[PDB]
Amino acid sequence: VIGRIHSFESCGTVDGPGIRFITFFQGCLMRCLYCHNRDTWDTHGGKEVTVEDLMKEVVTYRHFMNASGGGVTASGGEAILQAEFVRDWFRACKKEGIHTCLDTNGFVRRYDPVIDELLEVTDLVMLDLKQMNDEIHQNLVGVSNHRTLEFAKYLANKNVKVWIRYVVVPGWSDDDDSAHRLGEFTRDMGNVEKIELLPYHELGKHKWVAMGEEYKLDGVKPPKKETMERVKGILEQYGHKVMF
């Protein structure tokens, strides 16, 4: 099986537990307006690769991983689109005593055997919930949030170590209603270890510019500690380790 990837960071510090080897896969079906990897969308592009090649790199960093309590992370655009390849990669990592992390948007269309097979070999999934209010979601992301929420149910329903990531963008996900909805939604499920909030940042805009596409959020400045603070409490009410 061939893997089409955008790039990889031999060892990032903000892509899950400890220091991790992150591979950014090519292609994404969503169109978040704040996406900092816009050049990650196209299905075509990015180098092809095999797990043999990947491991031939990830292993050399065993050191930083063990020492940081890290591992590897599948991210980029939407890794879940190359589910066959990813689960193969984790199967290889599992067999190296390596910890696996899947950074996804959970837009799972067909629940094939490979989905369960991937999750079977996945240690932690940082599932993004971009907006509980679908009216907003459809405009913020370009698609309904039903498939993602279903994937969330699915996960909880199988006790999968989850981290909910909620990117807080001004005027779109900073309001208190949306904060409760999330807090309520994820409360049901107890497999969601914590809720990591992420402040919006202008970056990866040039990726749009470079692609003659207009970056709408242009101008939008990052949210204030006050705001993040507010949301945090709203969610800490439902009893989550809401750590931003």
């Binding site: 950014f24 990897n37 980029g76």
Partner: peptide
């Protein structure tokens, strides 16, 4: 810098 691919 979370999830930023250079």
């Amino acid at each position: 810098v979370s999830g930023y691919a250079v």
